[PDB]
Amino acid sequence: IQKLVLNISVGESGDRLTRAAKVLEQLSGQTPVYSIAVHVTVRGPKAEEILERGLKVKEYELRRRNFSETGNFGFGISEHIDLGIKYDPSIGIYGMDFYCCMTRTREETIRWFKQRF
Amino acid sequence: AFHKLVKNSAYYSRFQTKFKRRKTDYY
Amino acid sequence: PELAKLREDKILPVLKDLKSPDAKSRTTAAGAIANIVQDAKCRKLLLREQVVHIVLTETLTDNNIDSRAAGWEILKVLAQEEEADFCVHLYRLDVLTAIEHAAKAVLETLTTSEPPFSKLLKAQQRLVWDITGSLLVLIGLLALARDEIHEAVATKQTILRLLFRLISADIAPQDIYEEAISCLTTLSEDNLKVGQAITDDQETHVYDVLLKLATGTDPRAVMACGVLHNVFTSLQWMDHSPGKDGACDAILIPTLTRALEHVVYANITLLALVTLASIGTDFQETLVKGNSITSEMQADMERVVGADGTDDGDLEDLPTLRELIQTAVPQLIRLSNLPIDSDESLTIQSHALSALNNISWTISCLEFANGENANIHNAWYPTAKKIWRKTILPILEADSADLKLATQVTSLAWAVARVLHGETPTDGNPHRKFISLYHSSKEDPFQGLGVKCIGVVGSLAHDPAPIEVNREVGVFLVTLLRQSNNVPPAEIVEALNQLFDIYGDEELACDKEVFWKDGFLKHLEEFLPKMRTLTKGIDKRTQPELRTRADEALLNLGRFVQYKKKHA
């Protein structure tokens, strides 16, 4: 129930990586993290915001496997623009990884999702 | 039900927009 | 006639002046002649005046470089304005030899260390560049004109060597460099000896040069990609069987995509799009031959990556496809969408369309029934959907402009539908738009739009489609059948097959709610004989494909009406 972790990976060090970073920055407001891959974790307000906003994109229809035995879940999107962020041709398009960890199981979290959203 | 077809990929093979090389004018 | 009289008055002396065994009088005269020779009507006389012969025969062998250079320009200009036959004639006099010699000479000049090239007079080297220019062009047109010529050219080793020499050294003018790059592109396309010549070149290693170029940030990277792609496919460096250093087709796709990122040079854009489309048909070949934050939290995050993942894939063996999907198709869509404002982006759209069309038709040809190719299906389905909504509605919501673009986006929609199958989104009731297009649009046999509309429409009408959607569509097909009096036979085969694919399972709601409720099986028993007549009324020899197709359709219809009874 803590953090939302958006995640990008670009095997090619370079332009395309500093651009992925820029996206995660302006989208979370936090200066992103680096790993071959960038990502950023967001807690509290912005998390529920960015979560729903891309969950929109996925038409609120998931599959049952993405949820972890630890009752967590995630999904991918390929167009970080389908969430109302414009297109900067000096940035291009990037895909994003979305991941939601719950605390206070799979069953309980699936059911939790069904109730709210 | 059930059905009979053969070599289908060949059939729809054609649809792929196909290209080969080759103009401009006015100077 | 009269026009010709005034023409000969103007022209004849110039030829006689070139003809002059005043090789310098004609350095100035021949030097004049290309300018003189640009004119359209006038040329046909010039040709008929046997210029081709003279030039070939005399001018090129002269000791003064200005002669030969004027003469090679003459030929160039000619071949450009004129038509393909012309080149084929030149090939008959084996101008190839004449060129091979010419290129040897240029090659000695560049590679020489005695004069040597760089320390040449300014206009000296300008002359060489002028000669090279014409030479390049000629090889372009000649290769293009016919196949047997394209082969004949990729056999003259000196020619290849020169093309490599230039592309590799990059010490010539950009108009010349780019011309060389093109020339190689033509020769390298669906040709093996050239594929190998470029890879197997250790003299200048033109390969590694291209790779670097198509890999980095250079403004010309795309061109490099065009050649390299032609090579990969020519010698089958693909996913199932990569080249040296895993040089698969895939590695190109990033740079191509980045060339797209900027559009919102212009030629550079079109070229990349064209490449990407070819990559589409060529991975058809791939699939054919194939068969407080850190650490283990990340490790686990790989637990959810099972879900089709944006960033990287299950597809370690098919990087080409993932790069297409992961990187290419985003931009392909955006370009397919963005405004129709000029004719330039009208073209760019028609292209981005052609590309997505290609990719999609390739994949849609695979097997996915049951769990077949699950991984591929799981990567593609999302994208196929996205394409559908993102690019197939908007153009249909516009009802805007063109006819052949309608064919484009219809063909594409067919592909996407072939995969989606009733899982395909329904908004603004598109099946009606297409049906309308079928009736309003009322060659090669199966290129006609009616076919493509039958196809996409019957595709999206599988279970679990909205039962009403299913109904209307099935109705349209059966309608076609009852009034099969003027419908092209191709569309019969497609319609038949569509219904066969939709209503072969009694366990489907539509089987009862639609097929039985509206009693299609009657109309089927009605058409069985009609089908037999039109079938026998088709020429198995001109052409056989259609005939055999209809035959199997009748069998399965014949079989299927019979089967259809089996279940009440």
Author numbering:
A (entry chain C): 15 to 49, 66 to 134, 155 to 167
B (entry chain B): 2 to 23, 26 to 30
C (entry chain A): 26 to 289, 301 to 327, 385 to 535, 549 to 674
The authors write:
Typical examples are the r-proteins RpL5 and RpL11 which, together with the 5S RNA, form the 5S RNP. It concomitantly binds RpL5 and RpL11 in the cytoplasm, traverses the nuclear pore via the import receptor Kap104 and transfers its cargo onto the 5S RNA. Syo1 forms an elongated α-solenoid by an unusual combination of four complete ARM repeats and six HEAT repeats. Syo1 chaperones 5S RNP and masks the major binding site of RpL11 for the 60S ribosomal subunit.
As a first step to understand how RpL11 interacts within the Syo1–RpL5–RpL11 complex, we determined the crystal structure of Chaetomium thermophilum RpL11 (residues 15–167) in complex with RpL5-N (residues 2–30) and Syo1 (residues 26–674). Here we report the crystal structure of the Syo1–RpL5–RpL11 complex, which shows that both cargos of Syo1 simultaneously bind to opposing sites of its α-solenoid structure. The symportin Syo1 is an α-solenoid that binds RpL5 and RpL11 on opposite sites of the HEAT repeats, whereas the ARM repeats are not involved in cargo binding. RpL5-N (residues 2–30) interacts as a linear motif with an elongated structure and a short helix (Tyr12 to Phe16). In the ternary complex, residues Phe3 to Asn9 are relocated from HEAT repeat 1 and 2 to HEAT repeat 3 and 4 compared with the previous structure, and RpL5-N becomes more solvent exposed. RpL11 localizes at the convex side of Syo1 with about 1,160 Å2 buried surface area. The first one (interface I) involves a helical segment in the acidic loop of Syo1 (HS, amino acids Glu389 to Gly399) and the carboxyl C-terminal end of the acidic loop, which was disordered in the Syo1–RpL5-N structure (left). The RpL11 β-sheet forms a groove, which accommodates the Syo1-HS. The second one (interface II) involves the Syo1 HEAT repeats 1 to 3 (right). Superposition of our ternary Syo1 complex with 5S RNP bound to the 60S ribosomal subunit16 shows that H84 and the Syo1-HS share the same binding site on RpL11 (left and middle).
